Amino acid sequence: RSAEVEALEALPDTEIKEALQALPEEFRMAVYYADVEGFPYKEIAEIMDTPIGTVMSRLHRGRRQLRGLLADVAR
Amino acid sequence: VTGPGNRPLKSLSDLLKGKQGRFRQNLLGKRVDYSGRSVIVVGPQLKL
Amino acid sequence: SSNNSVPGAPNRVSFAKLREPLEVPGLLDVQTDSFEWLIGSPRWRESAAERGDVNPVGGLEEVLYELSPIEDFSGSMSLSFSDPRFDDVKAPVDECKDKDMTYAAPLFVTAEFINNNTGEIKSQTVFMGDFPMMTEKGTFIINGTERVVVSQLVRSPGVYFDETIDKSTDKTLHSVKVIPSRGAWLEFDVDKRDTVGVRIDRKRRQPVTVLLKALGWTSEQIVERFGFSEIMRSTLEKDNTVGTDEALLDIYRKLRPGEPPTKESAQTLLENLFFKEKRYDLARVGRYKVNKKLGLHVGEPITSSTLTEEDVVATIEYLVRLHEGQTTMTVPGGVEVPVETDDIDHFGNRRLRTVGELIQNQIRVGMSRMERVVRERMTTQDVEAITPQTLINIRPVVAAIKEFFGTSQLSQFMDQNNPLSGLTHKRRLSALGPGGLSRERAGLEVRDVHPSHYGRMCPIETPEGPNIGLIGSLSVYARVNPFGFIETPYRKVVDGVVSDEIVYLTADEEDRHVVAQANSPIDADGRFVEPRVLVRRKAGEVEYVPSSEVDYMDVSPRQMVSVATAMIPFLEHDDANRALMGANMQRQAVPLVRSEAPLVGTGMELRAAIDAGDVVVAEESGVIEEVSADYITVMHDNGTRRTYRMRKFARSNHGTCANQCPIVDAGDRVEAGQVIADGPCTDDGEMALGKNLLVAIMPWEGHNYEDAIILSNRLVEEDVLTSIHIEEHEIDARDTKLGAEEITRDIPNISDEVLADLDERGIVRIGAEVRDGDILVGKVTPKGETELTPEERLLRAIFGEKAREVRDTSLKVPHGESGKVIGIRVFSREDEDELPAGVNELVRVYVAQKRKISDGDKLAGRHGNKGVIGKILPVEDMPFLADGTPVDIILNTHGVPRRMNIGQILETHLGWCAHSGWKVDAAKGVPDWAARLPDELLEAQPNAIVSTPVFDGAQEAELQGLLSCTLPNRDGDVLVDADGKAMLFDGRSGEPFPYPVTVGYMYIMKLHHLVDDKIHARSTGPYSMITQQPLGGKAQFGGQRFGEMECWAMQAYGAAYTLQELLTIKSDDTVGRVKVYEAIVKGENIPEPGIPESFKVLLKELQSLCLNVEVLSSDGAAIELREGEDEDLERAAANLGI
DNA sequence: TTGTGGGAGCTGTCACGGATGCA
DNA sequence: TGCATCCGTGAGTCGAGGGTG
RNA sequence: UCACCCUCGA
């Protein structure tokens, strides 16, 4: 693991980035907390100040819209 | 104290001592990035 | 002239003026004799009868006789091993090298047990182990790699006296060491004050009277024998105690610390250490040395090899009488022994342990451990249930043999660049190793050429580096004594006549006689015409003596020379430095796609090639039945078929390709011993390490300045110096903590185009051309997901990836390496194959590259003239002869005279004479210059092959004569005048060069040092995990070490920022490296350096030594040296769009 | 937790200043 | 308690390849 | 990659 690999590892994917930017910020933060950071659903509802229904609805809807946004799948 | 093969175990003092200790080998001079080596051939074409 | 002792060998006309009365023995005999002795093969049997050593006893048989019998402490039961026997080999050599095995044969013994109580006998045949076997080429195969056992130089057992001057006072103190083949050492010394004492096992020196009275002597008895020595009388006057039993008890307390003294255990230990044959091994060589040195028992009493009380008395009397130094000394039973100190480097006192003795010495230890196990079993086991099978545990013997062949210093990776390298490697003599002197004990005086090395060890061939004088090649005519000495043949001179009776002499027997020289005037009958000849003195000093006193004469010149060194033409015209470099550089030459025998050589190419073992030879006279590129089948006059398979494009240990090509056609009649097919560097049976090139000796526009070399581009276009280089790549899929690795074409996040050269397995396909970074074997490894990417965990959590979480560990091509995939072999755990634990699959891909000659490649001749290629000009730029023939290689003039290698110039002259051929005019002929040597060298057709044997080569007058009768070219022009020079035309401007330049044909070798191997570059790469500095080595993609002296230079320049940048942001600053790469990538300025991580490692190392180290602020207290983890989260959360 | 049983290698290095330790 | 003797330290730089523990 | 050892190169 060189300094070259370490410096390029820091840069964003700029493909998953764009696809996430296309998602609604309300659903983007939800899929972030529940998937990237892996919070429990109640704790995500605690962080976003919104109840459980809102959180899980944004969760699955943003999941679907992101699924439709990216087809690369590591090619 | 000899490990299998009767070689003397490198002690905490051996890490500092000698030309291969920390001071000589790893502190006074080190291996660097952006460096290479190769065989040298004469070029009379070149300027100084 | 003809050298017709070898059938079918090409006719190399020899300038030799002297007949060869003895022929070069088997160059590998130093190895085969040793191993055939160790086994006891019938070849070795027959040999012994001839030797007259009627008592034949093998090495294994000897270890068995020393071990037998094995008696229990009660004496009730004994176990004796009787007969060693070998089952056939387990696998052939090729299969061993392919499957990473060891070429071995099962070893059986006949273990007879006897119970004296019940008086019962149980014989058996017990399996000792799989014994590694020596090949027909004299090598071994260990774990799939070919290896050679180097003969070790060790001092023979015996007593050795030395004169130690340079005490505190200018007073000669004499010391003596009694050194056995095994046991406890003995040492007798004298001090600054006059005394005599015995230093035993490094213990403090006790007066020798203690040992005298401990062996039973009384004061009245020892005072008699040493009465003429007042030093012994003074030591007895200064003696602490006088008595026998108290001497025993004091010797005991000297041997025994921390435990109470006792007289009974004193007697037992003192009698067991030396005179008991168990703990003390006096060698047969050692008994012979001591019985010749002290002359005590000369009436053939070899019945027992152990110290006799008379020989200790003789050693002490010798020590004390050596202070007086009277020549004749007579032990009470001894015989007129000369009293003199012993030379440690003399080859009469310095023997060599060959491979058989080293293997025997490891087997002895293993078997002694097995004997311990046998004695342990003899108690706990129920009698009437034991068998010789249940007593014997062969684990320590197998472990001993494995440890030897794997880790011993004397078991060396075989060096095979060309046949010659392996040939000499098998004949090397190494002074370092276990049982010999260590590396820090090697002084200048052990490395120098000893006068006893004449005809035994070559003084020219030896390493240039730190191993100088420590590794030396065995001479050509020398052979190893059964005792381990080196003998050299001579010619017995009776009544001043020289007969054909050859007598081999050791260094001991030689110094009694005065030896003549190989170059000597001889009456047609045989006698010296010169009044006084030059000879080697017993002292070794040269002198003059008449012809009736000469006892022996050299069998031949080159007697003192090794194989590789005797292949240098006009060696006698080169200095030992450049001759050494030439001998060492011959065996560094790579093989070429086709091998061209040298136009000018010695008689050693043929013999060295066929003895090297890389050539195919006919074992029996017959006619070739079939010839293919794959094999050659011959039909003997017996009617029996014999077939030889060709080694085709097989990689050697060093990467040089070893091809074999048939030199015979279908239907040819071959005599036994003829060469059937050439090896890598052989040509029609002769060693060809390079090419015959047209050379011009002149400085050319500075491109050959300071040892560089200018080449004709022809040598590229015509593949003259092109060589094939094979390299092996290996990768294995194993079981990790996360699961098992898989070798598969399925590689995530990879294009189909780069995978196009891979089969369904993920392995590259045979015949594809590979470039830097091309995938050789696809391999995926289960990823722990702890380092999994947050943006990738997004994918795994949203898309529900379940089955395969892997990463790309696939094998790729290293930097700067490219070629054509030759072969692929694969081993699978799914199939039946032996693989290490956890390793599922293991695949090897072989890749060959055709390397043309190029800038930087290393060329050298046989005369120590080296150099890299500065430039390769087009065939037009090269200076050309009058007929338009461009020279092939331009060697700078300034390099010849100062280096004292003028054999290259004579080689060039004779090479032109051999290229164009010559016809000496013989109408009223026999010109006085050509009368002496030339027999049928009078005329020679163009491109003839001739030989100049070292010290018998063509004389200067004969070469100057040949330079005149040079045959013209096809146009009738004589292109090279009688001066060896010629007019050359500058191929650039066209004007001819004003002066005639020496041109000719020189043998040039491509040494194995190529730019394709040596070029390296690293912007960034892997680091060592401990000190965080860049790794080292081209293989590891390492960086260059900027050492201490380089920092001294940088400081002397006063360049501070360069020194800091080299030492902080390029090497050890973990946060500065990625910062610098990021800054340059984004085109910004370079930031400020941080702290070297190795300094933190130093501080932690000091803290681990109970040293409280603290970095203080300007005025503050200790400063926190580590960093918080929250510095890296902001930019990550921002890149994810928080 | 029985009755039996004393290691492997080395050293073929040299020069110098100082504390150790012997007599 | 004055002095020999034994002990500890030091002994060029930078490269390449192989093996085994 | 860590440690040895070996054989080399200037």
- The answer to whether the CB atoms of A36 and C1022 lie below 8 A apart is no
Contact A9, C1118 (CB under 8 A): no
Distance C214 CA to D19 C1' (A): 38
- Compute the residue count for chain C: 1138
| Experimental resolution (Å) | 3.4
Amino acid at C455: G
Amino acid at C555: V
Q: How far is B8 from chain C (nearest CA, A)?
A: 16
User: Which residues of chain B does C1015 touch, with a Cβ-Cβ cutoff of 8 Å?
Assistant: 36-39
CA distance C1045 to A74: 50
Q: How far is A53 from chain C (nearest CA, A)?
A: 19
Strand, helix or coil for residue C1004: strand
* β-pair partners for C687: C682
Structural element, H or E, at residue C1047: helix C1044-1053
User: Which residues of chain B does C1030 touch, with a Cβ-Cβ cutoff of 8 Å?
Assistant: 30-33
Q: For chain F, which bases have at least one atom within 7 A of a protein Cβ?
A: 1-10
CA distance C1072 to C1080: 12
Cα Rg for chain C, rounded, in angstroms?
36
Q: How many Å from the N-terminal Cα to the C-terminal Cα in chain C? A: 93
CA distance B35 to C963: 53
CA distance C675 to C687: 12
User: Which residues of chain C does A34 touch, with a Cβ-Cβ cutoff of 8 Å?
Assistant: 797
Contact C629, C662 (CB under 8 A): yes
CA distance C1087 to C265: 78
| C303 secondary structure, DSSP code | S
C1046 in contact with chain B, both atoms CB, cutoff 8 A:
yes
Q: Which domain holds residue C256?
A: 155-352
State both tokens at C1: 């002239």
Strand, helix or coil for residue C486: strand
Orientation angle between helical segments C309-324 and C230-237, nearest 10 degrees: 110
Query: What are the Cα distances from residue C864, in Å, to C55, C421, C576, C910, C1005?
Result: 49, 16, 10, 18, 11
CA distance C721 to C716: 7
Amino acid at C704: N
User: Which residues of chain C does B34 touch, with a Cβ-Cβ cutoff of 8 Å?
Assistant: 1018-1020, 1066
User: Which residues of chain B does C1011 touch, with a Cβ-Cβ cutoff of 8 Å?
Assistant: 38-39
C793 in contact with chain A, both atoms CB, cutoff 8 A:
yes
- The answer to whether the CB atoms of C705 and B5 lie below 8 A apart is no
Nucleic strand F within 7 A of Cβ C1036: yes
Query: What are the Cα distances from residue C271, in Å, to C71, C316, C1099?
Result: 20, 19, 57
C1046 nearest nt, CA–C1': E13
- Smallest Cα–Cα separation from C277: which of C306, C303, C309? C306
Distance C193 CA to E2 C1' (A): 18
Whichever domain contains C186, its CATH number is: 3.90.1110.10
CA distance C459 to C124: 52
Nucleic strand D within 7 A of Cβ C163: no
Q: Residues of C239-277 as b/e, b for ≥16 C-beta within 10 angstroms?
A: beeeeeebbbbbbbebbeeeeebeeebbbebbeebbbee
- Per-residue 3-state assignment (H helix, E strand, C coil) for chain B: CEECCCEECCCCCCCCCCCCCHHHHHHHCEEECCEEECCCCCCCCCCC
Taking C1' of F5 and every protein CA, the nearest residue is: C409
Distance C728 CA to E19 C1' (A): 16
Q: How far is C1065 from chain A (nearest CA, A)?
A: 10
- Compute the residue count for chain B: 48
H-type alpha helices, C388-448: 388-391, 395-407, 419-427, 444-447
- Smallest Cα–Cα separation from C938: which of C952, C910, C918, C915? C918
Contact C154, C435 (CB under 8 A): yes
In sequence order, the 6+-apart residues with CB closer than 8 A to the CB of C469 are C431, C442, C446, C447, C448, C462
- Within a 13 Å sphere around the CA of C144, how many CA atoms are in the beta-carbon half? 6
Structural element, H or E, at residue C919: strand C918-919
Q: How far is B2 from chain C (nearest CA, A)?
A: 16
Contact C196, C208 (CB under 8 A): yes
To which residue do tokens 């004298």 refer?
C190
Nucleic strand F within 7 A of Cβ C432: yes
- CB nearest to B29's CB, from C856, C1046, C1098: C1046
Strand, helix or coil for residue A43: helix
What's the order of all strands across the beta sheet hosting C197-199?
A: C158-164, C173-179, C186-189, C197-199, C206-207
Distance C376 CA to D5 C1' (A): 9
Strand, helix or coil for residue C821: strand
CA distance A3 to C1006: 39
Helix then strand then coil, in percent of chain A rounded to 5, is: 70, 0, 30
| C1062 secondary structure, DSSP code | H
CA distance C354 to B42: 47
CA distance C1085 to C875: 49
Pairing of strands C946-947, C600-601: parallel
How many CB atoms neighbour CB C914 within 10 A?
Answer: 25
Write phi, then psi, for C1103 (nearest 5 degrees): -60, -35
C1133 in contact with chain A, both atoms CB, cutoff 8 A:
no
Contact C222, C182 (CB under 8 A): no
- Smallest Cα–Cα separation from C415: which of C56, C753, C148? C148
- CB nearest to A7's CB, from C749, C790, C1074: C1074
State both tokens at C140: 């071994």
- The answer to whether the CB atoms of A10 and C1074 lie below 8 A apart is yes
- CB nearest to C790's CB, from A1, A36, A75: A36
Contact C983, C959 (CB under 8 A): no
Pairing of strands C939-940, C918-919: antiparallel
State both tokens at C151: 């003969």
- Smallest Cα–Cα separation from C39: which of C124, C130, C140, C133? C133
Amino acid at C519: N
Q: Name the E strands within C969-1107.
A: 981-982, 997-1006, 1016-1018, 1040-1042
To which residue do tokens 């004397």 refer?
C410
C701 sits in the region (left: phi over 0; alpha: psi -120 to 50; else beta) called left
Contact C475, C455 (CB under 8 A): yes
CA distance C863 to C906: 11
CA distance C444 to C44: 39
- CB nearest to C794's CB, from A10, A36, A75: A36
Query: What are the Cα distances from residue C906, in Å, to C368, C380, C861, C959?
Result: 61, 79, 13, 8
- The answer to whether the CB atoms of B44 and C702 lie below 8 A apart is yes
CA distance C858 to C1005: 8
In sequence order, the 6+-apart residues with CB closer than 8 A to the CB of C843 are C730, C731, C732, C743, C763, C777, C824, C825, C826, C827
Strand, helix or coil for residue C129: strand
CA A48, A50, A51, A52 dihedral sign is negative
* β-pair partners for C329: C337
- CB nearest to C1020's CB, from B30, B33, B40: B33
Nucleic strand F within 7 A of Cβ C1031: yes
Contact A21, A65 (CB under 8 A): no
C529 in contact with chain A, both atoms CB, cutoff 8 A:
no
The CA dihedral of C377, C379, C381, C383, to the nearest 10 degrees, is 120
Q: Which site among C438, C710, C1027, C1045 would you substitute to test the B interface, given the most B Cβ atoms closer than 10 Å to its Cβ?
A: C1027
Angle ∠(C516,C518,C519) on CA atoms, nearest 5: 105
| A63 secondary structure, DSSP code | H
Contact C1003, C907 (CB under 8 A): yes
Q: Name the E strands within C753-838.
A: 769-770, 775-777, 779-782, 806-808, 811-812, 819-828
C465 nearest nt, CA–C1': F8
CA distance C675 to C684: 7
To which residue do tokens 């005809």 refer?
C455
Taking C1' of D10 and every protein CA, the nearest residue is: C435
CA distance C857 to C723: 12
Helix then strand then coil, in percent of chain C rounded to 5, is: 25, 25, 50
Distance C167 CA to D18 C1' (A): 20
C1066 in contact with chain B, both atoms CB, cutoff 8 A:
yes
C791 in contact with chain A, both atoms CB, cutoff 8 A:
yes
C990 in contact with chain A, both atoms CB, cutoff 8 A:
no
C288 in contact with chain B, both atoms CB, cutoff 8 A:
no
Write phi, then psi, for C128 (nearest 5 degrees): -85, -40
- Smallest Cα–Cα separation from C1: which of C940, C959, C965? C940
CA A27, A31, A33, A34 dihedral sign is positive
To which residue do tokens 């990738």 refer?
C792
State both tokens at C101: 């095995």
Experimental method reported for this structure: X-ray
C1062 in contact with chain B, both atoms CB, cutoff 8 A:
yes
Q: Residues of C508-529 as b/e, b for ≥16 C-beta within 10 angstroms?
A: eebbebbbbbbebeeeeeebbe
Query: Dmax of chain A from CA atoms?
Result: 46
C358 sits in the region (left: phi over 0; alpha: psi -120 to 50; else beta) called alpha
Strand, helix or coil for residue C911: helix
